[PDB]
């Protein structure tokens, strides 16, 4: 089954208040996902919770 966590492949800055910023190499706790990486998921990292592009991470 799907990993609890993912690692960022690229940095993501976000654009709006509910987004989840991170840098390459950061370890994100995945709180909600779909079967698609061509989608946005919900995660927790760097003291925040929010959404991010799923093609920016690799499941651990």
């Amino acid at each position: 089954g799907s990993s609890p966590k993912a690692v960022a492949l690229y940095s993501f800055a976000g654009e709006e208040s509910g987004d989840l910023p991170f840098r390459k190499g950061d370890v994100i706790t995945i709180l909600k996902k779909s079967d698609s990486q061509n989608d946005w998921w919900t995660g927790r990292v760097n003291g925040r919770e929010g959404i991010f592009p799923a093609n920016y991470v690799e499941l651990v």
Partner: peptide, 11 residues
């Protein structure tokens, strides 16, 4: 390469 195109935001 450059960072990739993002998916469309979710509905």
């Amino acid at each position: 390469g450059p960072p990739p195109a993002m998916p469309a935001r979710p509905t």
